[PDB]
Amino acid sequence: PQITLWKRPLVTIKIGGQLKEALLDTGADDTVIEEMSLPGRWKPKMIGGIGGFIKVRQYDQIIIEIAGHKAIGTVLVGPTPVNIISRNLLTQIGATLNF
Amino acid sequence: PQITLWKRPLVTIKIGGQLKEALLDTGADDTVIEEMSLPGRWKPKMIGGIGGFIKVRQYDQIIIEIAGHKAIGTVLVGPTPVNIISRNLLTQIGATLNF
Ligand SMILES: CC(C)CN(C[C@@H](O)[C@H](Cc1ccccc1)NC(=O)O[C@H]1CO[C@H]2OCC[C@H]21)S(=O)(=O)c1ccc(N)cc1
Numbered sequence: 784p785q786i787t788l789w790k791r792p793l794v795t796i797k798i799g800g801q802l803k804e805a806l807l808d809t810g811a812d813d814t815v816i817e818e819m820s821l822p823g824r825w826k827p828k829m830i831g832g833i834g835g836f837i838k839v840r841q842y843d844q845i846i847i848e849i850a851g852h853k854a855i856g857t858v859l860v861g862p863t864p865v866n867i868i869s870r871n872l873l874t875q876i877g878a879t880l881n882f
Numbered sequence: 883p884q885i886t887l888w889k890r891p892l893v894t895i896k897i898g899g900q901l902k903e904a905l906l907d908t909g910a911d912d913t914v915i916e917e918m919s920l921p922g923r924w925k926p927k928m929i930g931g932i933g934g935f936i937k938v939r940q941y942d943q944i945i946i947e948i949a950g951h952k953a954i955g956t957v958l959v960g961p962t963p964v965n966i967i968s969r970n971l972l973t974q975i976g977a978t979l980n981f
Pocket residue numbers: 806808809810811812813814815830831832833864865867869905907908909910911912913914929930931932933963964966968
């Protein structure tokens with residue numbers, strides 16, 4: 784589909800068996816989701832942006848369903864104010880910016 | 883242009899006759915640039931990022947070229963990690979997300 788940017792590009796995704804609203808974010812290197820449990824191993828990481836850094840848990844090889852497409856990637860879990868779908872996952876569904 | 887997301891979607895922008903590097907960011911509502919001098923009066927604004935809130939200077943109706951595309955709108959100046967071209971200006975240059 785073609786998403787205009789008049790409003791925040793929010794989409795519904797399926798991760799860890801639950802539905803969540805997320806923001807499609809070309810300005811993000813890695814996906815960040817609010818606190819939730821995920822299977823497998825993880826390692827601590829610090830990610831920063833406007834306002835500073837937050838500590839998150841990094842899980843690799845996680846399956847995320849987005850717009851019918853099933854993509855696999857890294858997911859950071861921590862105290863983020865908004866769920867963000869980053870380039871790490873956007874590349875897998877072939878998302879591109881056009882103008 | 884059609885920009886893939888395997889690398890950061892960085893472009894060259896021109897503001898105040900100066901060339902700068904900026905990140906095309908669909909996950910941001912307003913455009914934020916690192917400290918620099920802009921004409922006119924500014925208004926206060928607080929924006930919340932991944933690490934919390936910060937105060938910035940809001941300048942309106944600023945002329946800015948983005949990847950060769952002319953735009954005129956609001957530019958926020960503050961301690962951002964990188965210059966970010968957000969939805970307020972992406973909509974002006976006719977940018978959309980596609981997949
Ligand atoms: C600042 C950029 C270099 C990177 N940011 C992504 C960006 O899209 C965020 C994404 C975002 C969105 C909402 C809340 C927090 C973070 N937007 C943002 O800070 O925008 C602010 C300016 O306009 C406003 O509109 C949204 C809040 C304001 S980030 O949230 O810090 C980030 C950093 C690292 C990772 N892995 C994932 C995300």
